[PDB]
Design a protein around this motif. Sequence first.
Motif, PDB file in Angstrom:
ATOM      1  N   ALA A  50       0.874  -1.193   0.000  1.00 58.25           N
ATOM      2  CA  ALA A  50       0.000   0.000   0.000  1.00 58.25           C
ATOM      3  C   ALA A  50       0.900   1.229   0.000  1.00 58.25           C
ATOM      4  N   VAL A  51       0.754   2.079  -0.997  1.00 61.68           N
ATOM      5  CA  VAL A  51       1.603   3.249  -1.144  1.00 61.68           C
ATOM      6  C   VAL A  51       0.710   4.473  -1.310  1.00 61.68           C
ATOM      7  N   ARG A  52       1.084   5.558  -0.635  1.00 62.93           N
ATOM      8  CA  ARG A  52       0.486   6.852  -0.915  1.00 62.93           C
ATOM      9  C   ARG A  52       1.625   7.845  -1.040  1.00 62.93           C
ATOM     10  N   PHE A  53       1.618   8.613  -2.111  1.00 63.87           N
ATOM     11  CA  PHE A  53       2.698   9.540  -2.434  1.00 63.87           C
ATOM     12  C   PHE A  53       2.046  10.819  -2.921  1.00 63.87           C
ATOM     13  N   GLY A  54       2.382  11.928  -2.270  1.00 61.79           N
ATOM     14  CA  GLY A  54       1.718  13.172  -2.589  1.00 61.79           C
ATOM     15  C   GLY A  54       0.230  13.130  -2.334  1.00 61.79           C
ATOM     16  N   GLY A  55      -0.217  12.270  -1.403  1.00 63.88           N
ATOM     17  CA  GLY A  55      -1.631  12.115  -1.113  1.00 63.88           C
ATOM     18  C   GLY A  55      -2.392  11.186  -2.036  1.00 63.88           C
ATOM     19  N   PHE A  62       8.763   3.234  -4.426  1.00 63.07           N
ATOM     20  CA  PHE A  62       9.756   3.686  -3.452  1.00 63.07           C
ATOM     21  C   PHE A  62      10.968   2.777  -3.596  1.00 63.07           C
ATOM     22  N   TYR A  96      10.168   7.539  -6.261  1.00 63.49           N
ATOM     23  CA  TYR A  96      10.891   8.146  -5.133  1.00 63.49           C
ATOM     24  C   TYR A  96      12.141   7.297  -4.940  1.00 63.49           C
TER      25      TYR A  96
ATOM     26  N   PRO C   3       9.892  13.505   2.792  1.00 66.17           N
ATOM     27  CA  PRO C   3       9.926  12.485   3.846  1.00 66.17           C
ATOM     28  C   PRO C   3       9.229  11.212   3.408  1.00 66.17           C
ATOM     29  N   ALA C   4       9.694  10.096   3.974  1.00 61.05           N
ATOM     30  CA  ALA C   4       9.087   8.810   3.739  1.00 61.05           C
ATOM     31  C   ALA C   4       8.823   8.095   5.054  1.00 61.05           C
ATOM     32  N   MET C  41       5.777  10.562   1.226  1.00 61.48           N
ATOM     33  CA  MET C  41       5.637   9.180   0.801  1.00 61.48           C
ATOM     34  C   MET C  41       5.306   8.319   2.016  1.00 61.48           C
ATOM     35  N   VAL C  42       4.319   7.439   1.864  1.00 61.46           N
ATOM     36  CA  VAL C  42       3.926   6.463   2.884  1.00 61.46           C
ATOM     37  C   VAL C  42       3.860   5.097   2.222  1.00 61.46           C
ATOM     38  N   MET C  65      11.880   8.584   7.431  1.00 65.96           N
ATOM     39  CA  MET C  65      13.066   9.059   6.737  1.00 65.96           C
ATOM     40  C   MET C  65      12.843  10.505   6.343  1.00 65.96           C
TER      41      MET C  65
END
Lengths: 115, 99, 100
Positions: A50-55, A62, A96, C3-4, C41-42, C65
């Motif tokens: 599960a990824v969220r990047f910039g919302g 990643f 990223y 940030p991550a 980033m999450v 990070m």
Amino acid sequence: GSMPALVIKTNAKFTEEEKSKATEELGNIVSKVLGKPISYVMVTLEDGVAVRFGGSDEKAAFMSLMSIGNRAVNKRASAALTKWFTDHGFQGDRIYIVFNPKSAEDWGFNGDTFA
Amino acid sequence: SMPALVIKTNAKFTEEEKSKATEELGNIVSKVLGKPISYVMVTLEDGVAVRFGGSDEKAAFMSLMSILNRAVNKRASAALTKWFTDHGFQGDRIYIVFN
Amino acid sequence: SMPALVIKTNAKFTEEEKSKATEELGNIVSKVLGKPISYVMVTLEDGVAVRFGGSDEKAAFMSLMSIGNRAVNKRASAALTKWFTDHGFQGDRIYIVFNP
């Protein structure tokens, strides 16, 4: 940049065969841009994360590139790794990439360290 | 002041194999770092796509985070690698990064 | 400067539970680090084998990070832990490491 390890996480879902090809091709890219032989290159690829990047949870990736011990090399590595993903349909600004260089005494291999 | 060991492998483990691995590798970390038994965070992800030296043979990647030194890192590398070679992994397909 | 937050848990989440978690945890990172959400980033992995304090009870591991101090780190730890304790985790089974 010896002993490089590239750790990849993406929310895309790949088949097993797609992952096998991806680790080969991404590893070869690392070998080429860092000028290191493939025998020391490590690649890990986790999909379905599960990824969220910039919302947004649209397709994203990643990556952390670790190595023993450069402005120029980092730029070429970023571009080449990002191109693998854009060639497979990802938007480049959702890739990223972080770089984590390490000292020889902070790298374990074959049960020892190079310090 | 508590270390963390993050483990990724393309090997596939049963639930009991995972349970034993996180216990035994966690105890290795505690002992080598001079920390109390069980005073460690361990994560283990199996079935990960891994390639090392161009080969998709069984391999393992580990990150050991401790808030370590040249000497301790060598003892840690040897002790963790021994766990893997005792469980059928090639010693030269074990990468450990220290943080 | 981007940030991550990398999260691992032995809990099992549905896709909808994961979607809500990455949104709310990312929003916490934005706030505590003072960065626009466009830079955050999450990643969230569930079903991980975890042992913490010798126990494989429900737990969560997080690595944050971000380039760089004690004060922000304290607020970040508190805010991220509150999300987990509000969502059914025990507070002493939440481990957060900072990598500047």
